[PDB]
Design a protein around this nucleic acid. Structure first.
Ligand SMILES: [Mg+2]
Ligand SMILES: [Mg+2]
Ligand SMILES: [Mg+2]
Ligand SMILES: [Mg+2]
Ligand SMILES: [Mg+2]
Ligand SMILES: [Mg+2]
Ligand SMILES: [Mg+2]
Ligand SMILES: [Mg+2]
Ligand SMILES: [Mg+2]
Ligand SMILES: [Mg+2]
Ligand SMILES: [Mg+2]
Ligand SMILES: [Mg+2]
Ligand SMILES: [Mg+2]
Ligand SMILES: [Mg+2]
Ligand SMILES: [Mg+2]
Ligand SMILES: [Mg+2]
Ligand SMILES: [Mg+2]
Ligand SMILES: [Zn+2]
Lengths: 108, 153, 148, 166, 292, 308
RNA sequence: CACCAACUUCCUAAACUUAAAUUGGGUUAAUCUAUAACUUUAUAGAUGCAACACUGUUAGUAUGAGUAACAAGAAUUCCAAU
């Protein structure tokens, strides 16, 4: 079936400017207290989450170097230490990961 | 009609769905924090919880060992489950995982994203949301109300 | 064409005929060429008819400007502020003479559709009709079926 | 091709006299050749009409369309030049007066079909225009009240004349 | 006639502003640095005695302007619309900070000040109402209170439920107008001239002037109404969303004159409360609050 | 931003107040429910006697499920279980206001949470001093049978042996084709049919050049109000307020239904034997048995049936 | 026991009498040349001398339509990695 007539610019304006087809405004945008960048209420902050993932990559890069190959997963717990820190008694017999930089303020 | 169907349709079929979930579960055990699409991580969350239940049964149980063998493709991780993760969650009765929604992926498909992890890991803490302190204006008024009712019978 | 054009009501500039009639045309300008076939008829008009027209109408100031020209033109201006312009290219003396007389009689008001031929500011002497005219009153001003 | 939007930034008015309201500033900015359809860009340009700069930038940051990112960068440059070149005091004191999309110069190519046939393909482009005006956004629209509606109706009845008579 | 007092008081209030404004000639630049957590290291160069903390928030973005209720200039709370004086360090406080104690008091004072303005213009012009003081009560108390002494002819009359509702409708109309909280620090001499009629006001003014090394007293005006203040106040009256005049209690030891204390509650737009939660808090705000 | 933002009850609640507010609301429900337990000692409206042509109020119940049942002849009947749960009378209209010849009463049931409701509804319930209800419906009642608002109703309002009417929303099946929706035959599977198996045939005749209004076509099915007429009552459980009704009732389990006595011609004036205004346990003239039965019903714990 | 109703007819001003192939006559848009004119004109001599319509030719832009249709296995410590 083919169109029997051309549709006019007036009719076309009514189809594509209908309120059903317009972009809706958002009411759930807020500012992040820690960084001051914007976020949605039900979603994690992107800027703050970006910090954590960067550190996570560094730790995992170090973990890869120590193991030296695949199929080398330890059977004991893991822990991370930064320069100026030494293992406690409770830390005995647990894999230790060493980072050159100092302990990040946010990391506890 | 899909009344009462508790599974999503994923992959190339029923068998393909299991294999996709198995790969995500194996990655979670090794790394303990993972990013997937929100729908896929939500489907895999259930299996992650039940795996910690078989681990609790113990190394010597024949059924537990068979189940662990199937669901962990890399075999260096079966010792980890029975001797690291299972001891960690001895006290709790559940709620071993934490899952949160992440900003949409910036890769031209704009997928809804999530991050799923096991509680108690060694990684830097996630930036979770905190409730308001009791020092705020609304909290104080409710605290005042609580004290009066408690003290006055 | 009526729906495609503007319209107005019949009027006069300043109540022209009440106390005294005043002629609305006040200025004429005519431009000529000394030696150009197109403006020959206008030249004869200046030779014969221009002076006589000025005397009969003393309230109009007339300007005649010979200069090198391609089309002879006439400009008429009125008291209310209207301006009208006419080309006189290659016209006879009789044509120009009759054209000038029309301009004198006109008032500068626009020539467009006039809604009505007649205009009155005091349409009624005995009072305009309203529904209560021709309706009898009633005793005590009782509306129908009111008991009292 | 016409480039008039650019030159609008170079108008100079004479100094204002002491007894006169302070004239607000105006900024015109655009980006010309963009690999995006103008029909699609319209929906984005329409949304931010009338809003302040901060509210506009907030809504753009969480839209998934490719056009949203391009509009945001144009908005940021307009804000920067407003303070730097047009003597605007406060960054936040700005609202979007005008925003619209326009057609660009396009390209023609071939699109293949299944019996040795073909069709004509267009690679489409568009422009984006904005005008920034200093000051808080003007107040929104208030629908007519019931009393306001009635007052118009009496006015209509009072205007009646006796038609086609002396 | 009360109208006379409002007119003359405004005139003196306006005159004092002009005098201080004329005192500052030309423009002087003051370096003020942002010490808050976010956007750290920004430096605003501002005009002395004209620019305010709110103008600083204007430079950054509109999120600061809407959400910031107070500022800490060198560790002291400053009204958002109160002009700055010298180079300093600045920080902005909001209702949701971890320690909003300072903000809570400032909001609490402003609501009471609104309550007093409603009282004076509510009653018939015949009777005489004089405002005595605004007590300082912790938010835990459950309501903000205002003390007022009414006319002798009213000593036998207690407000009905419809009367209390009328006061709330008046208050809600004051919020709709969205008026700023103006601020003045003026020598005690001018304050006494502005409150000579109110004996209670006069003595209070003396107490505050005595405490400070100089005779500086804090005056605040919303619309026509003027009053002395214990501290900083909310930038505007639009901050409030929920407002209620709970009840009125007659103080027993009131032989010479009958002192009636009006109690109310309010919540800001930022911290709205659900329907049922609001009801419970209101009922607990109808019980007499002692000043401790 | 100087613009709108949305909130919900939990947004600003702190850790301690979160649990406290939950407990505070729960207690408020209990206090308001106990207060209404004594209607007869709360200025009840006058109680008129039964007259021919009288109509009585009904109840709102929740659909539990089904189970089997047997009669003294050994015939087996499937039955559905309806539980009355916090049913009160809410509002009364006089005959003239309702615009019907008869008056009307509104009933609510199944207490619900207060947190996610509009203010208008909460204000309406605060006036009546009751916690909100999930659903309201209207019943046509005569003047003699009018009951004061705020009076609880119970399952013993019905008694075994009477027929009843039930109405509820049916199960929703979504957008469906003509074969399932209207039982159209369809087309053959083989013998050369080309992409026409489950489709409708011709809509109408060619002459009219249009489609008649009301033509049967694909569309959304289910999720509509339906009524079942003439269902007998087999037994009542006073302790748990359970009614047993013959046969099937529309809707899924855990769905609210409307129960009223039958309007069929045969059972025109059976209301005389039943409690005329309603059943009041507050009167406490006699305590009812835990289980009420019908004579034909074979109760459990009776000796095995012998068809002697 | 009448009224209403067609430029038929009368009245003020004018006019001087009834579909179409084909047939007889008065003007004129545009451009060039001769001779003039000088904000675009005159008398003559000329011609590739006038397009709402040929499923006309060429170029441009719409409609159908933002529609039909098109595409990259998973996680990570990263695309000649595991
Ligand atoms: Mg239409
Ligand atoms: Mg489902
Ligand atoms: Mg095309
Ligand atoms: Mg059966
Ligand atoms: Mg369904
Ligand atoms: Mg078949
Ligand atoms: Mg087939
Ligand atoms: Mg037809
Ligand atoms: Mg004729
Ligand atoms: Mg013809
Ligand atoms: Mg030709
Ligand atoms: Mg053609
Ligand atoms: Mg198109
Ligand atoms: Mg279509
Ligand atoms: Mg489609
Ligand atoms: Mg498709
Ligand atoms: Mg593929
Ligand atoms: Zn953040």
């Amino acid at each position: 079936a083919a169109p029997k007539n051309r549709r006019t610019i007036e009719v076309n304006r009514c189809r594509r400017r209908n309120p059903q087809k317009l972009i809706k405004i958002k009411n759930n945008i807020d500012i992040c207290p820690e960084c001051g960048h914007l976020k949605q209420k039900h979603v994690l902050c992107g800027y703050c989450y970006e910090k954590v993932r960067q550190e996570t990559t560094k730790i995992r890069q170090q973990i890869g170097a120590q193991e030296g190959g695949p199929f080398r997963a330890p059977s004991v717990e893991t822990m991370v230490l930064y320069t100026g820190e030494k293992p406690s008694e409770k830390d005995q017999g647990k894999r230790i990961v060493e980072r050159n930089i100092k302990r990040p303020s946010w990391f506890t | 009609i899909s009344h009462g169907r508790v599974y999503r349709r994923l992959g190339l079929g029923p068998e393909s769905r299991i294999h996709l979930l198995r790969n995500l579960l194996t990655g979670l055990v090794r790394h303990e924090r993972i990013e997937a699409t929100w729908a896929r991580a939500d489907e895999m969350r259930g299996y992650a919880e039940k795996l910690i239940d078989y681990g609790k049964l113990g190394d010597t149980n024949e059924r537990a060992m068979r189940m662990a063998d199937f669901w962990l493709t890399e075999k260096d991780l079966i010792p980890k489950l029975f001797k690291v993760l299972a001891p960690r969650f001895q006290g709790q009765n559940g709620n071993y995982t934490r899952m949160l929604q992440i900003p949409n992926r910036k890769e031209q498909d704009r997928a809804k994203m999530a991050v799923i992890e096991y509680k108690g890991n060694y990684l830097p803490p996630l930036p979770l949301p905190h409730r308001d302190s009791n020092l705020t204006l609304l909290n104080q008024l409710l605290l005042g109300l609580q004290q009066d009712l408690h003290h006055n019978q | 064409t009526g729906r495609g054009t503007s319209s107005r009501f019949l009027t006069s500039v300043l109540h022209n005929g009440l106390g005294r009639y005043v002629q609305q045309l006040q200025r004429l300008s005519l431009s000529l060429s000394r030696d150009a076939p197109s403006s020959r008829g206008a030249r004869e008009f200046v030779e014969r008819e221009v002076t006589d027209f000025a005397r009969r109408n003393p309230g109009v100031v007339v300007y005649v400007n010979p200069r090198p020209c391609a089309m002879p033109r006439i400009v008429a201006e009125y008291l209310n502020g209207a301006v009208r312009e006419e080309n006189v290219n290659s016209k006879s003396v009789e044509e120009i003479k009759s054209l000038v007389q029309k301009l004198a009689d006109q008032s500068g008001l626009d020539v467009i559709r006039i809604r009505k031929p007649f205009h009155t500011d005091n349409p009624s002497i005995q009072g305009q009709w309203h529904p209560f005219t021709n309706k009898r009153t009633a005793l005590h001003g009782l509306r129908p079926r009111e008991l009292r | 091709i016409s480039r008039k939007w650019e030159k609008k930034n170079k108008i100079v008015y004479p100094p204002q006299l002491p007894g006169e309201p302070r004239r607000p500033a105006e900024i015109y900015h655009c980006r010309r050749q963009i690999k995006y359809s103008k029909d699609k860009m319209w929906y984005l340009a329409k949304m931010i009409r009338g809003m302040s700069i901060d509210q506009a930038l907030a809504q753009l940051e969480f839209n998934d369309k490719k056009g949203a990112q391009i509009i945001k960068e144009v908005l940021l440059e307009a804000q920067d030049m407003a303070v730097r070149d047009h003597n605007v005091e406060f960054r936040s004191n700005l609202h979007i007066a005008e925003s619209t999309s326009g057609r660009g110069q396009c390209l023609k190519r071939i699109r293949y079909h299944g019996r040795g046939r073909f069709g004509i393909m267009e690679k489409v482009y568009c422009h984006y225009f904005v005008k920034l005006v200093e000051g808080p956004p003007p107040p929104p629209e208030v629908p007519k009240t019931a009393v306001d509606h009635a007052k118009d109706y009496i006015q209509q009845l009072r205007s009646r004349t006796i038609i086609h008579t002396l | 006639s009360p109208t006379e007092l409002t007119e003359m008081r405004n005139d003196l209030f306006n005159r004092e502003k002009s005098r201080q404004l004329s005192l500052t000639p030309r423009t002087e630049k003051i370096e003020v640095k942002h010490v808050g957590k976010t956007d750290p290291g920004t430096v605003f160069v501002m005009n002395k005695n004209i620019s305010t903390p709110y103008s600083c928030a204007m430079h950054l973005s509109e999120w600061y302007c809407s959400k910031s209720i107070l500022a800490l200039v060198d560790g002291q709370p400053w009204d958002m619309y109160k002009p700055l004086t010298k180079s300093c360090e600045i920080k902005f406080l909001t209702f949701k900070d971890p320690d909003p104690k300072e903000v809570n008091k400032a909001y609490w004072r402003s609501c009471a000040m609104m309550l007093g303005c409603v009282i004076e213009r509510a009653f018939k012009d015949d009777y005489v109402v004089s405002l005595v003081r605004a007590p300082e009560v912790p938010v835990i108390a459950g309501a903000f209170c205002y003390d007022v002494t009414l006319d002798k002819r009213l000593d036998e009359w207690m407000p009905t439920k419809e009367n209390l509702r009328s006061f709330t409708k008046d208050a809600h109309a004051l919020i709709y107008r969205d008026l700023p909280f103006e601020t003045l620090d003026v020598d005690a001499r001018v304050a006494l001239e502005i409150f000579q009629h109110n004996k209670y006001k006069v003595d209070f003014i003396e107490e505050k002037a005595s405490q400070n090394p100089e005779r500086i007293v804090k005056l605040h005006r919303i619309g026509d109404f003027i009053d002395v203040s214990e501290g900083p106040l909310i930038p505007r009256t639009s901050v409030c969303f929920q407002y209620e005049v709970s009840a009125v209690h007659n103080l027993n030891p009131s032989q010479p004159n009958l002192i009636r204390r009006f109690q109310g509650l309010s919540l800001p737009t930022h911290l709205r409360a659900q329907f049922t939660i609001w009801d419970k808090l209101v009922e607990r705000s109808r019980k007499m609050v002692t000043e401790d | 931003l100087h613009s709108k933002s949305s909130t919900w009850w939990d947004e600003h609640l702190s850790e301690e107040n979160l649990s406290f507010v939950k407990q505070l609301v729960s207690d408020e429900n209990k206090t308001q429910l106990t207060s209404k337990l004594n209607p007869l000692k709360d200025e009840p409206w006058p109680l008129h006697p039964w007259e021919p042509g009288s109509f009585r109020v009904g109840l709102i119940a929740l659909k539990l499920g089904m189970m089997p049942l047997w009669t003294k002849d050994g015939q087996k009947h499937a039955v559905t279980l309806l539980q009355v749960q916090d049913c009160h009378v809410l509002k009364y209209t006089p005959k003239e206001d309702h615009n019907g010849k008869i008056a009307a009463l509104t009933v609510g049931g199944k207490t619900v949470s207060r947190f996610y409701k509009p203010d208008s509804r909460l204000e309406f319930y605060r006036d009546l001093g009751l916690p909100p209800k999930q659903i309201h419906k209207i019943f046509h009642v005569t003047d003699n049978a009018v009951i004061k608002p705020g009076t609880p109703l119970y399952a013993a309002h019905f008694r075994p042996g009477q027929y009843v009417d039930v109405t509820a929303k049916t199960i929703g099946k979504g957008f469906q084709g003509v074969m399932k929706r209207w039982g159209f035959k369809g087309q053959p599977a083989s013998h050369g049919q080309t992409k026409t198996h489950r489709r409708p045939g011709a809509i109408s005749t060619g002459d009219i050049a249009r489609v008649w209004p009301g033509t049967k076509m694909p569309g959304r099915m289910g999720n509509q109000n339906r009524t079942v007429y003439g269902l007998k009552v087999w037994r009542v459980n006073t302790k748990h307020n359970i009614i047993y009704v013959n046969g099937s009732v529309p809707g899924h389990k855990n769905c609210l239904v409307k129960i009223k006595d039958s309007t069929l011609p045969a059972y025109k004036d059976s209301c005389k034997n039943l409690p005329f205004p309603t059943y009041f346990p507050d009167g406490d003239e006699e305590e009812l048995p835990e289980d009420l039965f019908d004579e034909s019903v074979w109760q459990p714990s009776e000796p095995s049936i012998t068809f002697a």
